[PDB]
RNA sequence: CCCGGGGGCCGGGGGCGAUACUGCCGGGCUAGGGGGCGGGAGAGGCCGCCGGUACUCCGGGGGUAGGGGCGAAAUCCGUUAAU
């Protein structure tokens, strides 16, 4: 039998965070961040960091019962970057190799339907 | 240079003529303008009510120990449970 769940990915430009939950999302089976499996701060948003963090979390997911999951990839949406960072693709690649059965893949980046004033003033982030 | 004569010295007033244009008075028009009627267009304004995601914070549940940020860090947030 297949027990289903959700692989939530947070792929910003500074890290990557993979929490695996049940279908309702109320219960977390595994959660690994990039810095949790990476030697230094500079290597957190690397795809290599995601690929280790992806396989490390999914290994716990299989050990704790979960055997098939969907993937919901996201970036920091709204007043930030509206697409997943440079580690989300590597994260899902290690997910497929981990033995999990893959369901649907969705982008759930929170899109503002207008917005709020974002940082960095008005001249820009180099002036 | 002096003498003689004509003109001008840009104007004022008088009389007699013309009425093309301007002016005034009278009559009449609709071409400029304004006032209308009809169906539509418009982030035009003021007021009232409602919504959409996003965000931040607060309360509770899951789960450990990182998160955040950078060129790289650090400050900072986090073991009174964070992301
Ligand atoms: Mg500034
Ligand atoms: Mg003379
Ligand atoms: Mg004289």
Q: Which of A69, A107, A114, A65 is nearest to A88 (CA)?
A: A107
- Resolution of this PDB entry, in A? 2.5
Query: Measured from the CB, is A120 under 7 Å from any atom of strand B?
Result: no
Query: Measured from the CB, is A65 under 7 Å from any atom of strand B?
Result: no
Distance CA A66, CA A103 (A): 13
Q: How many C-beta atoms surround the C-beta of residue A37 within 10 A?
A: 20
| Solving technique | cryo-EM
Q: Which of A97, A90, A109 is nearest to A34 (CA)?
A: A90
CA nearest to nucleotide B68 C1': residue: A14
> What's the CA A74/C1' B71 distance, rounded, in angstroms?
25
Distance CA A23, CA A115 (A): 31
C-alpha A124 chain-centroid distance: 28
């Amino acid at each position: 039998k297949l027990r289903w769940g959700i692989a939530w990915i947070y792929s910003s430009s500074n890290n990557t965070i993979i929490t695996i939950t049940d279908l309702t999302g109320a219960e977390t089976v595994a959660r690994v961040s990039g810095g949790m499996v990476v030697r230094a701060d500079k290597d957190k948003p690397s795809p290599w960091a995601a690929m280790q963090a992806a396989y490390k979390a999914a290994q716990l997911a299989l050990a704790r019962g979960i055997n098939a999951v969907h993937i919901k990839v996201r970036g920091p949406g709204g007043y930030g970057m509206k697409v997943p960072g440079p580690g989300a693709s590597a994260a899902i690649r290690a997910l497929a190799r981990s033995g999990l059965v893959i369901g649907r893949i969705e982008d759930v980046t929170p899109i503002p339907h207008x917005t709020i004033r974002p940082p960095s003033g008005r001249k820009g982030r180099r002036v």
